[PDB]
Amino acid sequence: MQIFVXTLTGKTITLEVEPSDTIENVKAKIQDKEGIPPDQQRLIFAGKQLEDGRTLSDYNIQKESTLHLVLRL
Amino acid sequence: MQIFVKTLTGKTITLEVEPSDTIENVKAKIQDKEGIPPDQQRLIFAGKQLEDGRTLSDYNIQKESTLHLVLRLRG
Ligand SMILES: [Zn+2]
Ligand SMILES: [Zn+2]
Ligand SMILES: [Zn+2]
Ligand SMILES: [Zn+2]
Ligand SMILES: [Zn+2]
Ligand SMILES: [Zn+2]
Ligand SMILES: [Zn+2]
Ligand SMILES: [Zn+2]
C-alpha cells in the first residue's frame, strides 16, 4: 500500500503502511525511516490530530491518501 | 482568567490568559501545552480569524470563552 507524509518544509516522504496499522505504528515507521522519536511527532489528517492506538482505517485513510501528517515536537 | 480552545484532536484544552494578552502570546501558550509552533497555528473566534499583535480584549473576549483552532499548512 502507500501513503504520503508531509512535513513543515514541504518535504514529502512515502511510507509502506499497514491497513489497520495503529498510529503508534506509523510513528515507528517514520523513525525507522528518518529517525525522529515517536514521542516527538504528532500526526494530523484532514484537520484532525490522530491519536496512537487508533488505526488508519479508524480514520478512513486509503492508499494514495495524504497524511500531512505532519510534524511534531 | 480562563479561556477555552478547541483542539485539532478535539478534546477541549484550557488556557490561563490575561485580558490584554496578544495573540502571538496565546500561540506561545499553546506551544507550551501541545508543542505546536505558533507559526503553524491559526486561531479563530466567533467566525473571525484573530491576528497576532491584537489582544484578547481588542476582540471582545472574556471568561470561559472558547477559540477553536487549526493549522496554517503554509507549504
Ligand atoms: Zn524518547
Ligand atoms: Zn504518541
Ligand atoms: Zn490537507
Ligand atoms: Zn477501532
Ligand atoms: Zn500579567
Ligand atoms: Zn513556557
Ligand atoms: Zn505568527
Ligand atoms: Zn492593540
Numbering used by the authors:
A (entry chain A): 1 to 73
B (entry chain B): 1 to 75
The authors write:
Post‐translational modification of proteins with ubiquitin (Ub) regulates various cellular processes, and defects within this pathway result in numerous pathologies. Ubiquitylation is orchestrated by a series of enzymes (E1s, E2s and E3s) whose action culminates in the covalent attachment of the Ub carboxy terminus to Nϵ‐amino groups of lysine residues by an isopeptide bond. Ub itself has seven lysines (Lys6, Lys11, Lys27, Lys29, Lys33, Lys48 and Lys63) that can accept another Ub molecule. Furthermore, Ub conjugation is reversible, as the isopeptide bond can be hydrolysed by deubiquitylating enzymes (DUBs), around 100 of which are encoded in the human genome.
